[PDB]
Ligand binder design. Structure first.
Ligand SMILES: CC1(N)CCN(c2cnc(Sc3cccc(Cl)c3Cl)c(N)n2)CC1
Length: 476
């Protein structure tokens, strides 16, 4: 993912592509903050293509919709689809989005962090133009290795000279430095500085709010998305193409929900998310409504969380897959009765009875929580509404013996869906373990992203997750 440059301007991108790149060279960068730009060299000139993300997916102008920028780049690198060829990534030497880079951090602060939070092989790199690599080794001690910047290259006092700190760190990760008395300076894992005690969320949010800290942390998490390019072959099959809301937003094969008692049709664009478990899925299409009810029935799910209106901005985000109040409908082999609807400030609850046609004894109540007030773009200005809704959903799920995973869906099933699920996972740790628990927001999001592509889409949702956890702790 070195083709992503976090701090460059359009003019800097043009100069880099014209002087250091060739026809086919490309890079991606942040823009209108919140948007991204794909800058590509074609026939000696540079084109800048807009990538928009309001919270549901990355929408590339003149291209398709994607779950992640890594999935977008992999797609165009492996497929005449962009109207523009993406042949050569133009690599970024900026270390600001590396997990181990801590810019302005003093040697005392670094020794304190490695001593309190580190273990064998924990390391960090901190900054007049030179850098310091600090490593903890043991069962213990901290060793500081000077990294010189001499004529644009980096070195540890001898040997190879690297074009970037990333190349240096990767080199000495593969080929560890050995102290002449035997100690191997193993760079096993970056020092974890994101894991906080829940009671100090206010302090961490205040520090992330200064010039912003939230942006740096989010883009450092985004930089790790290239480790999550898991196969999605089942969703790519000809017979499954029209079962996807967006052709390139697909479920990972290894966590997808497989539908078993089919017409003698094992596919649905949905994934199991394990942290209480969840099913993260897209809004129904007219041709997937029956598959949706087959999934809910098979998985024994008793609670559904819908995080979109049926229509937003004049566009269908989810077809109505449930009957009108008091009505009974058959959706293939499944029968649904809408027993009763209850309106609340931010949501509507629909009490549904689901059963298999011809088998009365299979009836179970499915409670559908339909959140109605999420803004068309961005996130809510206050998390209270989302928190009170998730608290109600949680108590409903907890009251039902052996209930299956909670189904959560929005439009593509990754942005608002990932946001609700991640807040739910974090607040569950705090409800049970109390305020004396460790929480790690990027760790939790990375874990959820390994089970469905692009879970949590934007820096605005990333910040909303911290705000929701802070609010939950303040009302404890
Ligand atoms: C100060 C910094 N420049 C920015 C903040 N920081 C940093 C480091 N790593 C991450 S990702 C991450 C975190 C925990 C577990 C997993 Cl699994 C992952 Cl993937 C992140 N979002 N931020 C340390 C370096």
């Amino acid at each position: 993912r070195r083709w992503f440059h976090p701090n460059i301007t359009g003019v800097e991108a043009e100069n880099l592509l014209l002087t250091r790149g060739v026809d086919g060279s490309f890079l991606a960068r942040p823009s209108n903050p919140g948007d991204f730009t794909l800058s590509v060299r074609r026939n000696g000139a540079v084109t800048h293509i807009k990538i928009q993300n309001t919270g549901d997916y990355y929408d590339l102008y003149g291209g398709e919709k994607f779950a992640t920028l890594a999935e977008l780049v992999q797609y165009y690198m492996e497929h005449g689809q962009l109207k523009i060829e993406l042949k050569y990534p133009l690599n970024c030497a900026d270390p600001t989005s590396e997990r181990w880079f801590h810019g302005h951090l003093s040697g005392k602060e670094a020794e304190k962090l490695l001593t309190e939070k580190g273990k064998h092989g924990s390391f960090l790199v901190r900054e007049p133009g030179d850098f310091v690599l600090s490593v903890r080794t043991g069962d213990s001690k901290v060793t500081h290795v000077m990294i010189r910047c001499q004529e644009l290259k980096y070195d540890v006092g001898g040997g190879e000279r690297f074009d970037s700190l990333t190349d240096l760190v990767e080199h000495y990760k593969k080929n560890p430095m050995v102290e002449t008395l035997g100690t191997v300076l193993q760079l096993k894992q970056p020092l974890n500085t994101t894991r906080i005690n829940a009671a100090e969320i206010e302090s961490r949010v205040r520090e992330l709010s200064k010039l912003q800290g939230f942006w740096e942390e989010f883009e450092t998490l985004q930089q790790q998305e290239c480790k999550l390019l898991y196969s999605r072959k089942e969703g790519q099959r000809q017979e499954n193409k029209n079962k996807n809301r967006y052709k390139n937003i697909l479920p990972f094969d290894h966590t997808r929900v497989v539908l078993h008692d089919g017409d003698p049709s094992d596919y649905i664009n949905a994934n199991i998310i394990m942290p209480k478990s969840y099913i993260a899925t897209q809004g129904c299409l007219q041709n997937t409504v029956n598959d949706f009810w087959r999934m809910v029935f098979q998985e024994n799910s008793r609670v559904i969380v819908m995080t979109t209106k049926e229509v937003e901005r004049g566009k269908s985000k989810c077809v109505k897959y449930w009957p009108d109040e008091y009505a009974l409908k058959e959706y293939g082999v499944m029968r649904v009765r809408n027993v009763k609807e209850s309106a609340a400030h931010d949501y509507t609850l629909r009490e549904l009875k689901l059963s298999k046609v011809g088998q009365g004894n299979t009836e179970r109540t499915v409670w559908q929580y339909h959140f109605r007030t999420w803004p068309d773009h961005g996130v809510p200005s206050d998390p209270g509404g989302v928190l009170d809704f998730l608290e109600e959903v949680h108590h409903k799920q907890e009251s039902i013996m052996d209930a299956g995973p909670v189904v959560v869906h929005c439009s593509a099933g990754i942005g608002r869906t990932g946001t609700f699920i991640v807040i739910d996972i974090l607040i569950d740790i705090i409800r049970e373990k109390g305020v004396d628990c460790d929480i790690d927001v990027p760790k939790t999001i990375q874990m959820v992203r390994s089970q469905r592509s692009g879970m949590v889409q934007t820096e605005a949702q990333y910040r909303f997750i911290y705000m929701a956890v802070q609010h939950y702790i303040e009302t404890l």
